[PDB]
Design a protein around this ligand. Sequence first.
Ligand SMILES: NC(=O)c1ccc[n+]([C@@H]2O[C@H](COP(=O)([O-])OP(=O)(O)OC[C@H]3O[C@@H](n4cnc5c(N)ncnc54)[C@H](O)[C@@H]3O)[C@@H](O)[C@H]2O)c1
Ligand SMILES: NC(=O)c1ccc[n+]([C@@H]2O[C@H](COP(=O)([O-])OP(=O)(O)OC[C@H]3O[C@@H](n4cnc5c(N)ncnc54)[C@H](O)[C@@H]3O)[C@@H](O)[C@H]2O)c1
Ligand SMILES: NC(=O)c1ccc[n+]([C@@H]2O[C@H](COP(=O)([O-])OP(=O)(O)OC[C@H]3O[C@@H](n4cnc5c(N)ncnc54)[C@H](O)[C@@H]3O)[C@@H](O)[C@H]2O)c1
Ligand SMILES: NC(=O)c1ccc[n+]([C@@H]2O[C@H](COP(=O)([O-])OP(=O)(O)OC[C@H]3O[C@@H](n4cnc5c(N)ncnc54)[C@H](O)[C@@H]3O)[C@@H](O)[C@H]2O)c1
Ligand SMILES: CCCCCCc1ccc(Oc2ccccc2Br)c(O)c1
Ligand SMILES: CCCCCCc1ccc(Oc2ccccc2Br)c(O)c1
Ligand SMILES: CCCCCCc1ccc(Oc2ccccc2Br)c(O)c1
Ligand SMILES: CCCCCCc1ccc(Oc2ccccc2Br)c(O)c1
Lengths: 254, 267, 265, 268
Amino acid sequence: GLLDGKRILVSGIITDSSIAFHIARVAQEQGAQLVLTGFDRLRLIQRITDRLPAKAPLLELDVQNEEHLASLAGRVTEAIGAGNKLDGVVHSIGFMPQTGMGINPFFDAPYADVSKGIHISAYSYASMAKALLPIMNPGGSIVGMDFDPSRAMPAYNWMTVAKSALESVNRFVAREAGKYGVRSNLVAAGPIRTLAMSAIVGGALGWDQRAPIGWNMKDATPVAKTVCALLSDWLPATTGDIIYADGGAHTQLL
Amino acid sequence: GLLDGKRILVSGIITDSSIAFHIARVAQEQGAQLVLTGFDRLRLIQRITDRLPAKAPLLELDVQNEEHLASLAGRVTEAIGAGNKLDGVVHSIGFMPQTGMGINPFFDAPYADVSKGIHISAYSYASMAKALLPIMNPGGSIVGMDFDPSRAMPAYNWMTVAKSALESVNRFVAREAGKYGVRSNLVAAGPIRTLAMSAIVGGALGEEAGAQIQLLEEGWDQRAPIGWNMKDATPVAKTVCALLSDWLPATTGDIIYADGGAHTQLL
Amino acid sequence: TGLLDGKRILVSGIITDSSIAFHIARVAQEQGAQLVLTGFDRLRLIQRITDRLPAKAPLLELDVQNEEHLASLAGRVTEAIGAGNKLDGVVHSIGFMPQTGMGINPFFDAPYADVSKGIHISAYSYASMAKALLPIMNPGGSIVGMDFDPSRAMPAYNWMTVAKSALESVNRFVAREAGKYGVRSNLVAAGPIRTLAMSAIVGGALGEAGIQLLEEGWDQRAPIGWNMKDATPVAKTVCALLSDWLPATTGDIIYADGGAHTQLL
Amino acid sequence: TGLLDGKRILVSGIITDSSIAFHIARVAQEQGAQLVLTGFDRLRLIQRITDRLPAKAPLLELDVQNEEHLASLAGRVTEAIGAGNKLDGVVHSIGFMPQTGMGINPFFDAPYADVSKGIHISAYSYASMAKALLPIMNPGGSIVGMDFDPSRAMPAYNWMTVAKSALESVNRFVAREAGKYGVRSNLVAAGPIRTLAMSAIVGGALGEEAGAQIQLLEEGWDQRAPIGWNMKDATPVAKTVCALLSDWLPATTGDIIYADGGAHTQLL
Ligand SMILES: NC(=O)c1ccc[n+]([C@@H]2O[C@H](COP(=O)([O-])OP(=O)(O)OC[C@H]3O[C@@H](n4cnc5c(N)ncnc54)[C@H](O)[C@@H]3O)[C@@H](O)[C@H]2O)c1
Ligand SMILES: NC(=O)c1ccc[n+]([C@@H]2O[C@H](COP(=O)([O-])OP(=O)(O)OC[C@H]3O[C@@H](n4cnc5c(N)ncnc54)[C@H](O)[C@@H]3O)[C@@H](O)[C@H]2O)c1
Ligand SMILES: NC(=O)c1ccc[n+]([C@@H]2O[C@H](COP(=O)([O-])OP(=O)(O)OC[C@H]3O[C@@H](n4cnc5c(N)ncnc54)[C@H](O)[C@@H]3O)[C@@H](O)[C@H]2O)c1
Ligand SMILES: NC(=O)c1ccc[n+]([C@@H]2O[C@H](COP(=O)([O-])OP(=O)(O)OC[C@H]3O[C@@H](n4cnc5c(N)ncnc54)[C@H](O)[C@@H]3O)[C@@H](O)[C@H]2O)c1
Ligand SMILES: CCCCCCc1ccc(Oc2ccccc2Br)c(O)c1
Ligand SMILES: CCCCCCc1ccc(Oc2ccccc2Br)c(O)c1
Ligand SMILES: CCCCCCc1ccc(Oc2ccccc2Br)c(O)c1
Ligand SMILES: CCCCCCc1ccc(Oc2ccccc2Br)c(O)c1
């Protein structure tokens, strides 16, 4: 398997549509041993993770909770056994209050709302790296999820700003991670039908055409595969960077 | 008179080294009628602005103060006369706490500090646009100051993240401003000796900050095909004035680099 | 009082009064510049066109594929602007790609001889012109070329996109050379404008063409809108770069496209 | 151990055992790929070099400026892999620029005939090879070319930088064509590697300003790379190419993957 013998933490499962769920499934199919983290509704999340190919410890992690972050490494070590470390970490976490999204006027989002979104969607990438690098092996890999924010667009509004911040954060996390022999990268995914897409983006409210190899919004697997590629030993010279799993859409104007 | 008859708001003057001070000076040399905004040290800033070529009204603006923002357009209108609107707005404002800068570990900056910096340095570009677009004329121009954050680097740390956010904010402000026939752009400047350079950046570099800033300039000037002088804000001020003028009428949501060309060269 | 008062500027690329170069020339003269013009092939026609400008400027022949023309260029310019005078600006507004390299013609079917001709005229010649003219430019001077953002592929532009990608790279190296003379080098990436090249080269290779959709999409993306029939905003931007008001910008690209490239949709 | 198990892959660009293409071929074979190799001009030497690979692989002649070679390529490949079989992968690891276009030679003094030859071999031929080989590629297939980030100018690289800028653009159009076949096209932008191609850049540069500039660029690369950069180690670049050849980056095309230690993401 691509990830045989690798110990990987995966955050961000909320439903079986979650990009993180597919990342977890594919990683398990590829031999990885997982530690999962979930936010808020852990009982409900556990029922979802029970549907994964293999058993995995589920740990609670609210990235705005300083104690959760402080205790994370210790709780992970308890789950994987003393003397063992992680080889991979997946940040698949985002949030933005409704005022910062959709048809709500860009100028009307209060800073308190924007700040919450940036905390959860961007700063927390640094928080998780801070918490977990001390228990990561050399050759390890941290991967976060991105949506190309290089151009403005309808609806994505302040989440675009949060992703621009996340890209910059990733470049600095790479400088820290390199001290541990660890890579840090983002995967910029095209649109996928997830809860966030439905409840956050859709609640607040061309890709296949542009993508030379097409794009299926109902299929998170190609994105999951791309994350697994970064978690593997097969992109060993790439860090601080962004890999686009978007069908090539961002490389085409029409 | 590049800006003859234009009414332009300029924020960000704190000393006569401020990039905003030179923007104001050059704009007045080019015929602009200014309204200035200052933060915190209003008595001192008034003395500074007395050193500008022409008299200009000074208004208080703390961009974290909701009341200041809510009253801003009315206060500007009082300053320029009823029925008159602005043709230009200059955002030349930033802040980051020391924990977010320099040799202080990147991971050790608390979010409260990072958030304050992002509020002042990035969100406030949207706040200022929100406040002032209702009193801007078609053909108008909003300009903010940037430092190219497309790559990470020593010391700039969380301010790099704030500038990355600011660039994104600018692209959305352009969408809103277009409804008013107004452009929104950033000028990404090379390093200039200002109070922020000395007190924020320099303060966080530890001992021999002076030598490190000298080395930064040396590298920048080497990389820049036309060279770079960190003691001279005039080239940056002229660039901002170009964007405030009628001579870049088809540019919006964009970034103009006033950096000697350094960002175009690897070595 | 003009933006370009007292400046001596060479402008290449006029073929009709719709040429981007024609509008650049017009605005530059309105702003006090003294021009020397260069033209390719149809010189008598070009002379008739330039009789429509505010002031009649000398026209020099320049086929950028002709080594003899390039070798004699600086001397001919100096005679036209008067010995003792140097240039303050140079405008490269030149491009070409054979039909095989454009439109609905298959990308893979363009022979290298055709692609190479297009790259010679559209990209290499920016270096050729800088080589010829830098020795007669004043410090503070400005070389400007015309670009069309090639960072993403698109229908129809095909191999011209490749030539523009090459041109952007050439510009960054010309900036290194030009800096030795205190001269800036930059490109203006313009949105779509109804010119002879748009009609004859682009439109011609589109076959059964009538571009309307291109205009509508561009104007929709551009937060301040975009008018394909109006070259003036592009001409103004070029004049900004020729002026003293962007003195710290070189090796760069300024986008005069209504902001379209900053918006996804 | 089997990243490319069962995949048939063409690898161009081996001239020495220091060639990036040699290491690509080596790593691909380690991962189960069945290769066909192509070489230019010195075919006897290249055959002896390719005998040093972990497994045997047929060698074909290909001068990318030779229209006849390109026209016969698909048929010669099919002869090598057997009728009814197709390629799953293609590696373009080919570059050339005449001496006038590189190094201490002034940028303005390179004649267009020289620049054009370099662009022909280094950029246009990516399209040439895709045109020839797409009709014999399977869906899910992958074409990969080698890039050196040309987004900023730099000392010595001169007209090759222009050729790479052209190659990046070509790749985006090749992706449009390749997509019709269900095939991806991407470039790997590698950091500097001490292949025997280095003399093309540093040749004659000692004592000249360019000499120190080239070394400064190389040392700066390792400095900027958050995980460091070893110019003597082609393996990480080879692995990256293999990742693109694999089934594990199925949604990436018209794109550039940077195998450079992360250096391009850091200003200092
Ligand atoms: N769905 C898409 O189209 C798409 C495209 C590109 C990038 N992304 C990114 O992928 C990642 C996952 O999003 P998704 O589309 O799978 O939607 P999702 O709703 O399935 O996952 C989002 C996750 O964020 C978690 N989260 C929110 N606040 C948290 C907190 N305070 N602490 C810890 N976790 C918290 C949620 O609990 C949830 O599991 C995000 O970074 C998102 O921006 C999604
Ligand atoms: N100095 C450089 O090298 C350089 C380079 C590129 C970009 N910039 C940018 O230029 C701009 C001006 O910086 P400067 O270098 O002229 O330094 P400066 O210290 O002269 O100006 C910074 C300004 O921010 C103002 N400010 C801070 N908090 C504020 C608040 N809550 N409300 C309103 N104003 C507030 C300060 O009072 C001051 O006037 C900033 O955006 C900075 O990041 C500076
Ligand atoms: N029209 C647009 O939409 C548009 C948009 C962006 C950039 N551009 C660029 O603007 C510039 C001018 O193009 P235009 O649109 O005004 O079309 P145009 O047809 O009016 O001008 C093109 C010019 O190229 C000149 N030229 C061709 N071969 C030459 C040679 N061998 N030597 C010297 N000159 C030669 C022609 O004579 C002509 O004057 C080009 O670089 C073009 O790619 C055009
Ligand atoms: N070595 C580096 O640091 C580096 C870094 C990034 C990218 N690259 C790229 O990697 C690729 C291989 O470079 P390398 O360093 O392994 O050098 P190399 O000399 O080992 O390989 C270059 C290959 O091009 C082949 N070639 C030249 N003309 C040809 C023609 N007419 N037809 C077919 N093949 C031809 C040569 O025979 C040779 O095998 C090139 O595209 C190069 O630009 C090299
Ligand atoms: C122009 C249309 C924009 C749709 C983009 C697709 C998309 C959907 C959900 C995302 O996940 C989130 C989006 C917003 C807040 C939180 C999360 Br998780 C995300 O990052 C990106
Ligand atoms: C050695 C690190 C590189 C920085 C050099 C240039 C510079 C200096 C001051 C700035 O102004 C600020 C910098 C940080 C916070 C607030 C302000 Br205003 C700024 O944006 C950029
Ligand atoms: C749907 C197709 C896209 C058209 C874009 C607009 C445009 C038109 C003409 C141009 O000028 C030329 C275009 C090609 C060859 C020569 C010249 Br000059 C140019 O650069 C760009
Ligand atoms: C100042 C820059 C120093 C580092 C450059 C690394 C490098 C070396 C050889 C290359 O391959 C070639 C470069 C030129 C001609 C032929 C070939 Br193969 C190439 O693309 C890139």
